[PDB]
Structure formats: structure tokens, C-alpha cells
């Protein structure tokens, strides 16, 4: 056993969404071993927060039309799925949005909770055309992982059935795109030994370094069973 | 015979599933067989899945 462990070298954060992470030195073949196994956990298993429920006033269903609003309610729900939200303390927060007058309703119009950060405040949700028009809604953000559709969520719970509650497809996973590469390491005299560049392209909330840390933790927790129980 | 009628309108939102028929525009038919997870799909060197 010539155990040679890699170490986190450099995190080239080009943007808050897109960041490269270089990794060296890796012994031959471990570059692709961790590369893919991590990519899989980073795609599907990464916990995140996502808009689960919405409840707009003057709205009985998502297919209706609201006066003084360019977008149909479905297109508003779409914008709320891609609303970047980070809940710090609790798993479930129900934010309130009341806004009026002529203006594109941005994410900053939502009343921020003590422990809730709206990561992109300039994110568009709805367009108010008429000055007389006012919009009011209650946006529930819950935490989960992966992607939970509204068609899978309308066939499980349904204990309380309040008429006026629109469910939304949850985009819980924060990682949008991920693709690991391999480059020259140029260490001491290892030569063969190289590195592993993990390029991540995420939303706002989950931080590149933090996310890779969590993904390696999930893989190590699955490996407990193969180390401990034989 | 008819005294009154109530017409109800439902809205189903059906998503794609195995069995649904798809095609292009050159007569190339097909049936979805499996929705493969994003983790499993092919991806180019850039990293973007098919």
C-alpha cells in the first residue's frame, strides 16, 4: 500500500454561479473514479431550498388570468421555481409578497424573514402593467433534494386541502451543470500523477467549495456500510 | 325532457411518460421507453448532458 492522498489546491471562482476546483495529486485512475462518482452526487443528492407552494389572492387556480398582469399565473409560478432562496435556520418558511403600481415585480419585493436570504433580489417574478393593479401572494419555500414534481406531490400527502393553494414543481438541487476534467499536475517528480478540475455551474445559494465538501461527505457515509459491515 | 344542464370544465396537466408517442418532421416516429436520470445520460467534454 503506497497510499497517496490528493489535497484541495485552488478554487478558481470565475463567478458566484460558476467555479473551477483543481485537485492534485491523484494516483493513476483515481481522477475519473472520484470525478464521476462525485458528479453523480452533486447532480442528484445535493440538498437545496425551492418554492413548493404558492397562494395568490384573486386566484383559484394556476390557469386563470389576473387583471393588470402581463404574465399568466403559470408563467409566474415558473419564475418562482427559479427564485434563488436560502433558509438558514428552519426547513420551511412561508414568505409574503404584496406589491402595487407600475413596475416589474422583482424578488426584493418579498418581505425577507429574519433567517431568510433572497440571493438574486433583481430576479423577475411578475410584470404589473396597470398602476391601479396590486398583487398579493404567499410563497412557501421548503428544503429538499433533487427535483420533486407537482404530479408526484399530488399523489402522497393531501391531508389538508385548502382551496386557493397552487403547488409548484420543486427544483431543490442547486447544481445546474457539472463536468470534471483532468490536467497536468507538474508536482515534484511524480510525472504520471495528475489533478482533477471539477467545473460546477450552480444557482446562487449553494457555495462551490461547500457543495463539494457535502458531496464527498455523502459518499463517505455510503462507504460506512462497505468498511464497517465487511 | 331536459330541464337544466351544468357544463363542468376540468384541466388535466399530463407530463410525458413511457408509452407517449413522439416524432420529428421527417416521418421519424418513436415511443418513450424510459425516462433516464440526468446523472445517467451521455455528456460532452464541456459537461452538458444530452
From Swiss-Prot, chain B:
It comes from the Bacteria. Disulfide bonds: none annotated. Co-administration of salinamide and rifampicin or salinamide and myxopyronin suppresses the emergence of resistance to both antibiotics. Acetylated on several lysine residues in the presence of glucose. The RNAP catalytic core consists of 2 alpha, 1 beta, 1 beta' and 1 omega subunit. When a sigma factor is associated with the core the holoenzyme is formed, which can initiate transcription. The rRNA transcription and antitermination complex (rrnTAC) consists of RNAP, NusA, NusB, NusE (rpsJ), NusG, SubB, ribosomal protein S4, DNA and precursor rRNA; S4 is more flexible than other subunits. In pull-down experiments interacts with CedA. Belongs to the RNA polymerase beta chain family. DNA-dependent RNA polymerase (RNAP) catalyzes the transcription of DNA into RNA using the four ribonucleoside triphosphates as substrates. Resistance to the antibiotics salinamide A, salinamide B, rifampicin, streptolydigin, CBR703, myxopyronin, and lipiarmycin can result from mutations in this protein. This is DNA-directed RNA polymerase subunit beta. It comes from Escherichia coli (strain K12). The lineage of its organism: Bacteria, Pseudomonadati, Pseudomonadota, Gammaproteobacteria, Enterobacterales. The chain holds residues 1045 to 1094 of 1342 of the full protein.
Amino acid at each position: 500500500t503506497e497510499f497517496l492522498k490528493p489535497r484541495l489546491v485552488d478554487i478558481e471562482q470565475v463567478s458566484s454561479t460558476h467555479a473551477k476546483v483543481t485537485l492534485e495529486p491523484l494516483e493513476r485512475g483515481f481522477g475519473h473514479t472520484l470525478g464521476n462518482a462525485l458528479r453523480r452526487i452533486l447532480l442528484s443528492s445535493m440538498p437545496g431550498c425551492a418554492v413548493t407552494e404558492v397562494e395568490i389572492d384573486g386566484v383559484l387556480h394556476e390557469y386563470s388570468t389576473k387583471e393588470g398582469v402581463q404574465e399568466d399565473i403559470l408563467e409566474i409560478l415558473l419564475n418562482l421555481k427559479g427564485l434563488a432562496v436560502r433558509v438558514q435556520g428552519k426547513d420551511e418558511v412561508i414568505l409574503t409578497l404584496n406589491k402595487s403600481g407600475i413596475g416589474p415585480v422583482t424578488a426584493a419585493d418579498i418581505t425577507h424573514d429574519g433567517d431568510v436570504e433572497i440571493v438574486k433580489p433583481q430576479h423577475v417574478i411578475c410584470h404589473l402593467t396597470d398602476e391601479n393593479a396590486s398583487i398579493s401572494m404567499r410563497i412557501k419555500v421548503q428544503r429538499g433534494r433533487g427535483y420533486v414534481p407537482a404530479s408526484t406531490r399530488i399523489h402522497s400527502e393531501e391531508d389538508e386541502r385548502p382551496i386557493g393553494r397552487l403547488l409548484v414543481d420543486a427544483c431543490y438541487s442547486p447544481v445546474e451543470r457539472i463536468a470534471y476534467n483532468v490536467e497536468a499536475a507538474r508536482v515534484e517528480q511524480r510525472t504520471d500523477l495528475d489533478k482533477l478540475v471539477i467545473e460546477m455551474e450552480t444557482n446562487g445559494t449553494i457555495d462551490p467549495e461547500e457543495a463539494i465538501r457535502r458531496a464527498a461527505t455523502i459518499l463517505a457515509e455510503q462507504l460506512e456500510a462497505f468498511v464497517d459491515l465487511r | 325532457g331536459v330541464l337544466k344542464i351544468v357544463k363542468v370544465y376540468l384541466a388535466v396537466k399530463r407530463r410525458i411518460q413511457p408509452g407517449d408517442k413522439m416524432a420529428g418532421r421527417h416521418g421519424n416516429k418513436g415511443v418513450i421507453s424510459k425516462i433516464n436520470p440526468i446523472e445517467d445520460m451521455p455528456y460532452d467534454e464541456n459537461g452538458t448532458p444530452v
